[PDB]
Amino acid sequence: LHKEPATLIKAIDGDTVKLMYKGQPMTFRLLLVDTPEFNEKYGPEASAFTKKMVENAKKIEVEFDKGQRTDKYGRGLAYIYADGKGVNEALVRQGLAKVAYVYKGNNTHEQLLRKAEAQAKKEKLNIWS
Numbered sequence: 037l038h039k040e041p042a043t044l045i046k047a048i049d050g051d052t053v054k055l056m057y058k059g060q061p062m063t064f065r066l067l068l069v070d071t072p073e074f075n076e077k078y079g080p081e082a083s084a085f086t087k088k089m090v091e092n093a094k095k096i097e098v099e100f101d102k103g104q105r106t107d108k109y110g111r112g113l114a115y116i117y118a119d120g121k122g123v124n125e126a127l128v129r130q131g132l133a134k135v136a137y138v139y140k141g142n143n144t145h146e147q148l149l150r151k152a153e154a155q156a157k158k159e160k161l162n163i164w165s
């Protein structure tokens with residue numbers, strides 16, 4: 037897989053973000069994770085965490101997996117990085133997302149994220165509390 041440039045347009049919630057990618061505005065949905073919706077428990081904390089991560093970043097990158105790059109809603113499906121750090125993994129590591137929506141052929145970072153989830157669950161963090 038390879039990292040490509042993008043710039044923040046706007047934070048949306050825990051696992052969606054609006055980015056400019058190849059010069060066009062797109063909503064991105066983070067692969068392999070699921071944050072609570074804003075109205076659910078840890079929803080607000082998940083949104084705040086992703087917001088801080090992407091807003092503070094000097095450099096946002098998007099990384100597509102091997103499979104479909106857009107979902108049925110026209111959202112881009114990617115791993116997103118903020119100053120080289122995985123947002124997807126950071127959320128799971130902090131117990132603010134669950135590994136989820138693991139579809140065959142877009143699952144390159146599955147095992148890396150499951151290892152993160154295990155540590156968050158061990159630490160009883162947030163969702164796992």
Ligand SMILES: Cc1cn([C@H]2C[C@H](OP(=O)(O)O)[C@@H](COP(=O)(O)O)O2)c(=O)[nH]c1=O
Nearest residue numbers: 065066067068069070107108113137139142
């Ligand atoms: C993360 C992801 C979600 N989706 C679709 C599946 C779910 O369809 P449904 O809307 O019919 O439930 C929805 C979950 O996204 P959200 O968790 O943002 O709601 O997004 C994909 O198709 N591919 C993906 O990789």
Ligand SMILES: [Ca+2]
Nearest residue numbers: 070071072073
């Ligand atoms: Ca969600």
